[PDB]
Amino acid sequence: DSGSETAFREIEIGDGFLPVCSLGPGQVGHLNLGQDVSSLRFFAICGL
Amino acid sequence: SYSSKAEKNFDPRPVETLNVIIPEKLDSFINKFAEYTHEKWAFDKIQNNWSYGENVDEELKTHPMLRPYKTFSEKDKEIYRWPIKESLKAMIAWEWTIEKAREGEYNPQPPDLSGVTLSRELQAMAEQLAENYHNTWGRKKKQELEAKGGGTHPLLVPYDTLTAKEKARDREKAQELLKFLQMNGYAVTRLDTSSIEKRFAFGFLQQLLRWMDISQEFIAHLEAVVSSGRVEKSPHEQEIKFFAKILLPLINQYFTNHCLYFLSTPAKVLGSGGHASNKEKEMITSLFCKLAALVRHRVSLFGTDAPAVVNCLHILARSLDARTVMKSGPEIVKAGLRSFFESASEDIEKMVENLRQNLTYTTVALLPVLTTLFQHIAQHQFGDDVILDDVQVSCYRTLCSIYSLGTTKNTYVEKLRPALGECLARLAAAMPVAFLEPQLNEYNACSVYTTKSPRERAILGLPNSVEEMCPDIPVLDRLMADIGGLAESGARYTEMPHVIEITLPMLCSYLPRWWERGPEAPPPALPAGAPPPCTAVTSDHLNSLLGNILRIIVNNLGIDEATWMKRLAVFAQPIVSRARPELLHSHFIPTIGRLRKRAGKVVAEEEQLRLEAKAEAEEGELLVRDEFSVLCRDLYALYPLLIRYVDNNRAHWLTEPNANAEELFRMVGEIFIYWSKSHNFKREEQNFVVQNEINNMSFLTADSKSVQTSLIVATLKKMLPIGLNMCAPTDQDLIMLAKTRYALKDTDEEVREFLQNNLHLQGKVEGSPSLRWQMALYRGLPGREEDADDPEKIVRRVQEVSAVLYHLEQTEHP
Q: State how far the Cα of B524 lies from the Cα of B512, in Å rounded to an integer.
A: 17
CA angle, residues B417, B470, B478, in degrees to nearest 5: 75
Burial class (CB in 10 A: 0-12, 13-18, 19+), B33: buried
DSSP reduced 3-state for B199: coil
Burial class (CB in 10 A: 0-12, 13-18, 19+), B553: buried
Q: Check CB contact under 8 Å for A44 and B702.
A: no
Q: Check CB contact under 8 Å for B776 and A37.
A: yes
CA angle, residues B488, B492, B493, in degrees to nearest 5: 135
C-alpha distances out from residue B148 to A38, B128, B155, Å: 91, 31, 17
DSSP reduced 3-state for B231: coil
DSSP state of B586: I
Instruction: Please name every residue paired with B97 in a beta bridge, in sequence order, or none if there are none.
Output: B189
Question: E strands along B322-475, which residues?
Answer: none
- Amino acid (one-letter) located at B680: N
Which residues of A are less than 8 Å from B699 in CB distance?
3
Q: Check CB contact under 8 Å for A45 and B655.
A: yes
Which candidate, B497, B297, B311, places its Cα nearest to that of B405?
A: B497
Which residues of B are less than 8 Å from A38 in CB distance?
780
DSSP state of B790: S
Which candidate, B685, B675, B667, places its Cα nearest to that of B597?
A: B667
Which residues of B are less than 8 Å from A37 in CB distance?
773, 776-777
Q: Check CB contact under 8 Å for B650 and A38.
A: no
Closest to A44 (Cβ–Cβ): which among B655, B699, B702?
B655
DSSP state of B461: T
C-alpha distances out from residue B741 to B76, B749, B751, B764, B798, Å: 112, 11, 6, 22, 12
Which candidate, B91, B82, B102, B185, places its Cα nearest to that of B130?
A: B91
For chain B, which residues lie within 8 Å of any Cβ of chain A, measuring from their own Cβ?
650-651, 654-655, 699, 702-703, 773, 776-777, 780
Does residue B490 come out as left (phi exceeding 0), alpha (psi in the -120 to 50 range) or beta? Answer: left
Q: Count CB-CB contacts under 10 A for residue B707.
A: 13
Q: Check CB contact under 8 Å for B777 and A45.
A: no
Q: State how far the Cα of B719 lies from the Cα of B712, in Å rounded to an integer.
A: 11
Does residue B21 come out as left (phi exceeding 0), alpha (psi in the -120 to 50 range) or beta? Answer: beta
DSSP assignment of B503-529: IHHHHHHHHHHHHTTSSSSPPSSHHHH
**Which residue numbers come right before each break in chain B (C to N over 2.5 Å)?**
8, 105, 190, 356, 705
Closest to A45 (Cβ–Cβ): which among B651, B702, B776?
B651
Q: State how far the Cα of B741 lies from the Cα of B410, in Å rounded to an integer.
A: 62
Per the CB < 8 A criterion, the answer to whether B655 and A44 are in contact is yes
Q: State how far the Cα of B215 lies from the Cα of B245, in Å rounded to an integer.
A: 13
Annotated resolution, angstroms: 3.1
Distance of CA B358 to the CA centre of its chain: 29
Q: State how far the Cα of B789 lies from the Cα of B759, in Å rounded to an integer.
A: 11
DSSP reduced 3-state for B189: strand
Closest to A48 (Cβ–Cβ): which among B650, B703, B777?
B777
Burial class (CB in 10 A: 0-12, 13-18, 19+), B534: buried
Main-chain dihedrals φ then ψ at residue B97, nearest 5 degrees: -75, 135
Q: State how far the Cα of B185 lies from the Cα of B174, in Å rounded to an integer.
A: 16
Report the length, in residues, of chain B.
814
Q: State how far the Cα of B212 lies from the Cα of B294, in Å rounded to an integer.
A: 8
Q: Count CB-CB contacts under 10 A for residue B123.
A: 16
Radius of gyration of chain A (CA): 15
Q: Chain B neighbours among A 3-42 (CB < 8 Å)?
A: 3, 37-38
Give A3 to chain B, closest Cα distance, Å: 5
Per the CB < 8 A criterion, the answer to whether B650 and B718 are in contact is yes
DSSP state of B533: P
Q: Check CB contact under 8 Å for A37 and B654.
A: no
Residues whose CB falls within 8 Å of the CB of residue B390, separated by 6 or more in sequence, listed in order: B338, B341, B342
Pinpoint the alpha helices (H) of B406-537: 411-430, 448-451, 454-459, 466-469, 476-489, 497-498, 504-515, 526-529
Report the length, in residues, of chain A.
48
User: Dihedral of CA B33/B34/B40/B44: which sign?
Assistant: positive
Q: Check CB contact under 8 Å for A45 and B773.
A: no
Residue of B nearest to A42 (CA): B651
Give B572 to chain A, closest Cα distance, Å: 22
Per the CB < 8 A criterion, the answer to whether B360 and B299 are in contact is yes
Angle (deg, nearest 10), helices B615-655 and B679-692: 80
Does residue B794 come out as left (phi exceeding 0), alpha (psi in the -120 to 50 range) or beta? Answer: alpha
Helix (H) or strand (E) holding B617: helix B615-655
Closest to B777 (Cβ–Cβ): which among A2, A37, A45?
A37
Give A45 to chain B, closest Cα distance, Å: 6
Give A5 to chain B, closest Cα distance, Å: 10
Q: How far apart are the first and last CA of chain A?
A: 27
Which residues of B are less than 8 Å from A45 in CB distance?
650-651, 654-655
Q: State how far the Cα of B72 lies from the Cα of B60, in Å rounded to an integer.
A: 18
Q: State how far the Cα of B369 lies from the Cα of B311, in Å rounded to an integer.
A: 9
CA angle, residues B209, B212, B216, in degrees to nearest 5: 155
DSSP state of B760: G
Q: State how far the Cα of B506 lies from the Cα of B431, in Å rounded to an integer.
A: 11
Q: Check CB contact under 8 Å for B655 and A3.
A: no
Which candidate, B658, B629, B632, places its Cα nearest to that of B645?
A: B658
Per the CB < 8 A criterion, the answer to whether B462 and B450 are in contact is no
Burial class (CB in 10 A: 0-12, 13-18, 19+), B638: buried
Burial class (CB in 10 A: 0-12, 13-18, 19+), B311: middle
DSSP reduced 3-state for B186: strand
Main-chain dihedrals φ then ψ at residue B782, nearest 5 degrees: -65, -55
Per the CB < 8 A criterion, the answer to whether B383 and B323 are in contact is no
